[PDB]
Amino acid sequence: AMSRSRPELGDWSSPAELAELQRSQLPRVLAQALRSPFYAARYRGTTPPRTADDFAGVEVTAKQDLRDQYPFGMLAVGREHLATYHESSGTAGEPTASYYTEEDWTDLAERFARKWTGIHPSDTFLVRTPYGLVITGHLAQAAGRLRGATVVPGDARSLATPLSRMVRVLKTLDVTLTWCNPTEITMLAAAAKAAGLRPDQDFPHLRAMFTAAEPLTEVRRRRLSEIWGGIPVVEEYGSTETGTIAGQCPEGRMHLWADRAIFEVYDPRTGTLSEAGRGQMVVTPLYRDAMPLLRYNLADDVEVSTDPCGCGWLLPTVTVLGHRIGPATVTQQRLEELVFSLPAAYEVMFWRAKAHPDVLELEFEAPEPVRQRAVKELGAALDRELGVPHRITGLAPGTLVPAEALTAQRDILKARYLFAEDEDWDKAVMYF
Amino acid sequence: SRPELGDWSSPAELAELQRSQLPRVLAQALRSPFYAARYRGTTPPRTADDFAGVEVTAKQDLRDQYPFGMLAVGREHLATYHESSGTAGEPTASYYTEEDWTDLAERFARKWTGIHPSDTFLVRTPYGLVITGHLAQAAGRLRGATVVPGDARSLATPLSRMVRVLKTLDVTLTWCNPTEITMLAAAAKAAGLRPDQDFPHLRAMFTAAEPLTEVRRRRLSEIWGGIPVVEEYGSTETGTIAGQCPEGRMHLWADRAIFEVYDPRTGTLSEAGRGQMVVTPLYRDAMPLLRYNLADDVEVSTDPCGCGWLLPTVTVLGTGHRIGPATVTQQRLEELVFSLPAAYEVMFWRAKAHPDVLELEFEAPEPVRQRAVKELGAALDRELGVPHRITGLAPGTLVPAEALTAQRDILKARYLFAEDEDWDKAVMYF
Ligand SMILES: Nc1ncnc2c1ncn2[C@@H]1O[C@H](COP(=O)(O)O)[C@@H](O)[C@H]1O
Ligand SMILES: O=C(O)c1ccccc1O
Ligand SMILES: O=C(O)c1ccccc1O
Ligand SMILES: O=C(O)c1ccccc1O
Ligand SMILES: O=C(O)c1ccccc1O
Ligand SMILES: [Mg+2]
Ligand SMILES: [Mg+2]
Ligand SMILES: [Zn+2]
Ligand SMILES: [Zn+2]
């Protein structure tokens, strides 16, 4: 590496060489970790870990530790070196703070930019995740700028950017790439149809859709691809606290970015850490100064395999998993496979289910002509695959996902205090 | 590379710094479909002298050329794409190269209070398509300040959460519109924090996007413990084109753009006086603008300022209503509302011009309400002489308690729920 310090795919040719690329960083990482109040307090009366060998003995860092240290208990650098500050999704009541130096950001941007489809100057990249405190909009934008793509900041959950306006942007700007959660991929598809555009034909420049943030079955991922004309739906896995830790290969598996972090699986029964198997995703990022994390337990239920993939990347794969009803165990993943196995022509995208002690209640939207078939087929799928008692109800479109979410436009107004006689002064101080 | 405050020592040297860029700027402008079509079949302007004759560019031209009619570079050289606030029905597209962004970031970073690594900077403006959030964030990154991306109009970041962030992160700088400054002050009290005492690290508040009287600006400062409220002037299409000096005048960033005043009656352009703000940015390659008429009503003065910056000053107006004998502007009413004593806590108000009467409502606590109505009535009598119907309202009437106190979990879509959970958050989870 003449110019770059941080590793790339191909700097190692064996699992043995990957482990050495990792362990060589641990002295710096362990020295940096001890600079934070949290780790200096953890190792108070003892000898701190310093060497790659000492790492074996290092205690897990829990989500609750990150919350107890709010806001800067995990901080290992002077505040003058921070570039951005972030907070996690979930509960507003117990915030999880994350923060990054400029150089931390180069590692974050590189990991997001590991998109098998590429990101190029030729791309127009719609970033359709929130920019409010969470990292996700900032992360995609930073990766877009790193690779020279035109970034369209769509934001998400903003009154400035309803779906109708995103559909017009996708079409008229010839957008080539999107970043949004998998539910937003279906929201955009429904908004396109309500504008009289066919997601499968009317966006010929759209070449890939980047997604994360929800457990996503291959059956649902394939349907989302088919809705949008058979283009790749490129999954990644991360968190505000870690950045992107795994990205899809051309074969459709997520591979751990183990050159940039030590990945371990925590068995909460035994409290053992292992390089692979089923249990809780544990991460030690190797290229971060501001907020060192030693064996941070994301508490996501994962399966990590060192088994080779068809792609040939020399990295482990990860599946992210994320209610029992009499004899059967019913998961969202299993129901999602059954819902998204209904024929595409039935247009079933929006659904929800509740586990009662004795019965699974499930609702979905479908057009009237196909609704009774969709109810019957999905019932028979549940009988055949799970054998749970069910109450399935088909609903009119606009019942779960209202028409106004899909078609309403909103002016981006500023506060006004003086109105003409014929104006609505309801928009005076509450103008959003 | 690009000029800094102090690189010119006279108005004559400033004009030379400008005119020297015009050949490049005029050549770049002609690369766009719009300007190539405008000067089709004629000889195009090429020299600093030719600039005098150049036709104004209207906001309607930017709308008519949606999306990339104003584009002077290959799309491969674009860094970001933006759209303006106002009507959703007629989008105004703008776009910038990486080098365009350095000029934008430098102009925003011209804050007389500075932006430093020692700063923690809450950006509380939208990131959704408009430039505003992205502009403040790029300036914070340029100057090394810790950027806290608050966003605005996002379900992710309600006022209650911004107030907790202001306090617990020791935020030193904010960027938000002047109404948001009062919204945050009301939200702070609802969270049990006194804006005038409980934010000791807050040192300055940056604001723009509303016509702002000195009387209102001073009150916003007093609400937040007497710290500077630093106004700038800009637009979603240009970024910051003027910034406040320590004397409280906004100075035009004329080293980065030629500023002219348009008389719409005659279509005469002038270096100073009354009329419509016209801007020709000098360091803007993706989307060249020749004499872009912002259509803001402004007064430009070349008079020297005590601050010692050798740049013209600008006052920004906004067009008001006849009510019997008198003409009432928002700015005039705002001066009267914000001349009520601070202890009355009149911040939220609205008014309607009828042909015969000014209807005005504001929130004030019950003990002060009748005095506030009487004093404000006498101010209107004394200053405007318009008939008025003034009503005092309970706090929570114009700005509801919910907007100030509601917390909102940042949920993701969920499809399987337990019996006792709210499944209304399944697909509509915002
Ligand atoms: N591709 C994915 N599949 C499943 N869950 C995901 C995926 N990406 C992100 N997540 C979830 O989202 C979390 C990130 O949370 P946050 O930092 O609050 O945005 C992860 O810890 C997972 O629980
Ligand atoms: O909410 C989202 O849209 C989202 C998308 C990707 C990653 C994290 C997120 O919160
Ligand atoms: O869920 C997230 O916040 C997230 C953040 C970074 C990258 C991928 C992700 O899903
Ligand atoms: O909407 C805002 O809060 C705002 C603030 C500053 C400048 C432009 C803006 O729209
Ligand atoms: O919209 C504004 O009034 C504004 C002001 C300064 C900078 C960016 C902006 O959009
Ligand atoms: Mg580019
Ligand atoms: Mg810094
Ligand atoms: Zn693979
Ligand atoms: Zn001055």
Author numbering:
A (entry chain BBB): 0 to 321, 327 to 436
B (entry chain AAA): 4 to 321, 325 to 436
What does the article say, verbatim?
We reconstituted the biosynthesis of the benzoxazole moiety found in nataxazole by adding two enzymes (NatL2, NatAM), to 3‐HAA, ATP, and Mg2+. We show NatL2 catalyzes ester not, as previously reported, amide formation; the amide is a shunt product.
We therefore soaked the co‐crystallized AMP:3HAA crystals with salicylic acid (SA), which lacks the hydroxyl at the meta position. In subunit A, two molecules of SA are bound but no AMP. One SA molecule, denoted SA1 has replaced 3‐HAA1. and occupies the same pocket with differences in orientation. A second molecule of SA, denoted SA2 is unambiguously located where we had tentatively identified 3‐HAA2. The carboxylate of SA2 makes a salt bridge with Arg156 that orients the molecule. SA, which lacks a hydroxyl group at the meta position, gives no reaction, indicating that the hydroxyl must be at the meta position for reaction.
